[PDB]
Every structure is written in structure tokens, then in C-alpha cells.
Amino acid sequence: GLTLALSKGRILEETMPLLRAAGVELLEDPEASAKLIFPTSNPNVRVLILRASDVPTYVEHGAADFGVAGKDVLLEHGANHVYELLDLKIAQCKLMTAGVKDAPLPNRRLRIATKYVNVARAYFASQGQQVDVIKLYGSMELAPLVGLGDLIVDVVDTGNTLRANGLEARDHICDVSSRLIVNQVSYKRKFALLEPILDSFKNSINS
Amino acid sequence: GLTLALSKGRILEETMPLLRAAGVELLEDPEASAKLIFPTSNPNVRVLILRASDVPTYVEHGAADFGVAGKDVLLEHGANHVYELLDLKIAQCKLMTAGVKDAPLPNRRLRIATKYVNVARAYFASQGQQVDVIKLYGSMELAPLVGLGDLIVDVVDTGNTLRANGLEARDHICDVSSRLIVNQVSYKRKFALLEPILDSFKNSINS
Ligand SMILES: Nc1ncnc2c1ncn2[C@@H]1O[C@H](COP(=O)(O)OP(=O)(O)OP(=O)(O)O)[C@@H](O)[C@H]1O
Ligand SMILES: Nc1ncnc2c1ncn2[C@@H]1O[C@H](COP(=O)(O)OP(=O)(O)OP(=O)(O)O)[C@@H](O)[C@H]1O
Ligand SMILES: O=P(O)(O)OC[C@H]1O[C@H](OP(=O)(O)OP(=O)(O)O)[C@H](O)[C@@H]1O
Ligand SMILES: O=P(O)(O)OC[C@H]1O[C@H](OP(=O)(O)OP(=O)(O)O)[C@H](O)[C@@H]1O
Ligand SMILES: [Mg+2]
Ligand SMILES: [Mg+2]
């Protein structure tokens, strides 16, 4: 059958309506289980629950035939060995730069504190800046408060996180939504299983 | 004053008794707050709550003067630009290799699924193996079930996680406890503040 890689929180929550419309429901709540492999109402489809970071890794190697990944994670991971088939328009946010509100930029090479080191470098390169990048894994909004780095790059949605910590978004880098990715082989070998799920999602997202 | 980097869960929980003995208590529970900078009973000491991965990063750059980091995270991060001053003997576990119980090793170059790619490489190198490493961020115990990689490297404590997923530990790599690390400059510049806290911890750990 098909293995679908998802992640907890917004992607699991916001994907389920798309799955339900396509004839696929989980038989329990993965948020409440230690389990990581879940059957569905469709015995041709099961689900993996992974860290957001690992969804492309699983789909690339074909541990999963397909997954739902944030565009931020694909941009950072590189998506050269998976096919991006659909923009699902869920878990919508922005990649942004940010700093202490009204904090002047220092006139030296910039230090960007981010999980998204490759996106930070590419974005600053497009703005004419070779920056240094301090790699972190969470709570990017702490970095500028303690003077770790001049700016951060992170996902902004409401901007509540930035505002609460006295930060403000400086640049918008790009819009981020979750994307349906397929294993390059799975697409060739199990398309008959993928296709009616792809067509259902495509129709669902139009609404 | 001094900034102490800690992380949530076991390290925060198991460090607090050491801090209390040294005259330092948090004025609230960081597990229940969105906040990330916490004053203490000691107005010369405040606390950062970070991802475990980021504690050395903060201490290295001196965003934090000192922190409590797992030895697994120091080994993987490299600890060449911090001083390891004490083995606190908390959050004790092992770095181990593991696979499907009784699964034979394939007679090709090995694929290790781990967060600890540098530890995996070093350990397999000491065993005469140049392995490939599939980088992941969590739920290492899923990898072998779906045939992502031949083995995993991960922290084992009770082994409950391995057993529940039908995995077994193959090799013990090394013992892991949390370590007190200092910024190389903070050690030189604020030793008068560090010393009585260091002496208290050292005494505490003897018991
Ligand atoms: N506030 C938000 N609103 C909407 N979408 C978001 C928001 N924050 C993140 N996302 C999107 O959701 C994806 C996954 O979010 P999630 O919180 O699971 O990631 P994470 O912080 O890396 O998780 P982990 O704790 O496993 O590292 C992101 O990669 C991004 O595309
Ligand atoms: N089961 C365990 N028993 C004891 N110590 C543990 C156990 N698991 C991990 N540790 C130790 O605790 C440290 C931090 O644990 P924690 O669970 O916060 O890490 P993590 O999974 O990277 O967290 P995050 O979700 O932020 O990525 C580890 O680096 C290790 O030294
Ligand atoms: O702009 P806002 O609406 O404040 O949202 C932005 C935040 O949302 C996400 O946090 P999440 O809830 O996933 O916490 P975590 O990812 O740090 O665990 C993300 O990590 C951002 O920090
Ligand atoms: O050998 P055991 O006693 O089963 O412990 C080992 C597990 O403990 C930790 O999990 P944690 O509770 O930190 O979950 P997480 O790190 O995967 O979030 C670690 O990630 C190991 O998987
Ligand atoms: Mg998150
Ligand atoms: Mg953990």
C-alpha cells in the first residue's frame, strides 16, 4: 500500500479534512499515542507521524511514498529528490527576518540566528549580503534578546511571538504553506493508488 | 550577572535540587510559561530555557555564561570552545546502536539513521566501518520498522522504547550524563560569581 508521512499539530489537524474527503480516516488520535504507524479507514493507506524536519527524508528514501511538508522545510532540506505535486494551502505562514524593534543594523557582516541556515544564506545572498549563520533548533525569538546574532529568520504567522518579545519582522522572505511531496519511484510504481487521492486533494483545496 | 542555559524536562527537573542547595530557586515553573528568561532567588543569576541542542551554542557564544548539556549533545556539537567543568551525573543514559531484534546485518556499507551523525561516524570508524548516516531529529525507533537505515544510534535509558518497537541495543557506545559547561571568557571574567556555585554543585554530586 501507500505510506503517508505527516507531522503532529497543525499539519495533522489541517490535513485530516483533505484525507477524510478522499476516503481516508485515522482509527485513533496520534497525538494521544506513543505509536508512530497508524492504519486508516483505507487498508491500502497507513500514516507515519514524524518530526516536520524528517517528512522529506522519509519520502526521499521511500520509507514513506508521500508526505505533507512545510515549504520552509523543503526549501531548507532541498527537495531535489522528491516531486512537489500540490500546494495544499494549509499551515500557512511566512519565512521572515526579525530583530529588536527599532534596533539599528550593525555595519559589519551579519550574524543570523535561525534553524533555516540555507534559506538565511540564499535570502541574504539575493540582498547582496554574505552573512554568518548561528544554527539553532527552537525559540529563535530568544536569540536577539540575549544578543545571540543581529537578526533571526523564522516562520511568522500572526506575529504574536515577535510582538510579545519586542521583535518586529524586517523582511518577508516568502510565503510558506504545506506541500504534497511524492517519492520519485512511488510516483512511477503506485500512481494508480496515488491518483484518486491527488484528484480529491486538488478538488478539496479549490474550496 | 550570570546567565545559566538549561533545557525542559529531565535536565530542568534534575538540576533544580543542585541549584536550590547553591542558593538559587526559580520564582515560577518554566514548563507552564511562554517566557524564556527567568529570574531566580539569586538576583546575580537568571536562567534561559533552550532546546537541549542549543545549550552549548548559547554557552559557546556567551549568550549564556554556563549551561547544563547532555554529554551526547556536547559530543555531537563538539565542545572545543566551551570548558566542561563537572559531570553532574543527572539525566543519565547511554548512546547505543540498535536494530530489529535478531535482524542480520547486511554485508554492504551500513546506513545509520540518527540525530548523532558525528557520534555515529566516529563510533563506526573505531569499529572499522565507514558508514552512511541518514540525519533525523526524533523518533529514531521508527526508522528500522519502515526500513530507513540498517541501524539507529540514539540515547537508551530503560530500553523500554527499543523493546516496545521490537528493537534491541546491539552496541553500547558510551555513558551519557549532563555536564556543566562554561563560556571560555565568562570563566576568566566572572569566576567570583561561578566559584561558590561550582563548589556547591561539586559537593552536591558527591551525594
Ligand atoms: N504559527 C504557525 N502557523 C502556521 N503554520 C506554522 C506555524 N509555525 C509553523 N508552521 C508550519 O508548520 C510546520 C511544522 O510545524 P511544527 O511546529 O511541527 O515544527 P517544529 O517547530 O520544527 O517542530 P519540532 O518541535 O518537532 O521541531 C512548519 O515547518 C511550518 O511550515
Ligand atoms: N530517557 C532518558 N533518560 C535520561 N536522560 C535522557 C533520556 N532521553 C534523553 N536524555 C538526556 O536528556 C537530554 C535532553 O533531553 P530532551 O528530551 O530534552 O532532548 P530532545 O529530544 O533533543 O528534545 P527536543 O524535543 O527539544 O529536540 C539528552 O540530550 C540526553 O542527554
Ligand atoms: O507568528 P505567530 O502566530 O506567533 O506564530 C509563529 C510561531 O508559530 C510556531 O510556533 P509553534 O506553535 O510551532 O511553537 P514551536 O514551533 O516553537 O514549538 C513557530 O515556531 C513560530 O515561533
Ligand atoms: O530507553 P527509554 O527509557 O525508553 O528512554 C529512551 C528515550 O528517552 C528519550 O525520549 P524522550 O522522553 O526525551 O522523548 P523524545 O526525546 O523522543 O521527545 C529519548 O529520546 C529516547 O527515545
Ligand atoms: Mg513547532
Ligand atoms: Mg527528548
Residue numbers in the entry:
A (entry chain A), B (entry chain A): 23 to 229
Question: What does the publication say?
Answer:
In Psychrobacter arcticus ATPPRT (PaATPPRT), structural and functional data indicate allosteric activation of catalysis triggered by HisZ (PaHisZ) binding specifically perturbs the chemical step of the reaction taking place at the HisGS (PaHisGS) active site located ~23 Å from the nearest PaHisGS:PaHisZ interface. First, crystal structures of the Michaelis complexes of the activated, hetero-octameric holoenzyme (henceforth referred to as PaATPPRT) and of the nonactivated, dimeric enzyme (henceforth referred to as PaHisGS) showed Arg56 of one of the catalytic subunits reaching across the dimer interface to form a salt-bridge with the pyrophosphate moiety of PRPP in the active site of the other subunit in the PaATPPRT structure but not in the PaHisGS structure. Therefore, allosteric activation was proposed to lead to more efficient leaving group departure at the transition state by stabilisation of the negative charge build-up on the pyrophosphate upon nucleophilic attack of ATP N1 on PRPP C129.
As expected, an R56A-PaHisGS mutant had a reduced reaction rate in the nonactivated enzyme as measured at a fixed concentration of substrates, since R56 was posited to be important for leaving group departure in PaHisGS as well, only less efficiently. The activities of R32A- and R56A-PaHisGS decreased 25- and 42-fold, respectively, in comparison with the WT-PaHisGS. The active site interactions are very similar between the two structures, except the electron density for Mg2+ in R56A-PaATPPRT was not well defined, so the metal was not modelled in, and the hydrogen bond between E163 and the PRPP 3ʹ-OH is absent in R56A-PaHisGS. The structures are also very similar to those of the respective WT enzymes. Therefore, any structural or conformational differences that may lead to allosteric rescue of R56A-PaHisGS catalysis are not captured in the static view of the crystal structure. Surprisingly, the apparent first-order rate constants for R32A-PaHisGS and R56A-PaHisGS with Mn2+ were measurable, 0.12 ± 0.01 s-1 and 0.13 ± 0.01 s-1, respectively, only ~2.5-fold lower than that for WT-PaHisGS with Mn2+, although still very low in comparison with those for R32A-PaATPPRT (~54-fold higher) and R56A-PaATPPRT (~20-fold higher), suggesting the more efficient charge stabilisation ability of Mn2+ can partially rescue the activity of these mutants.
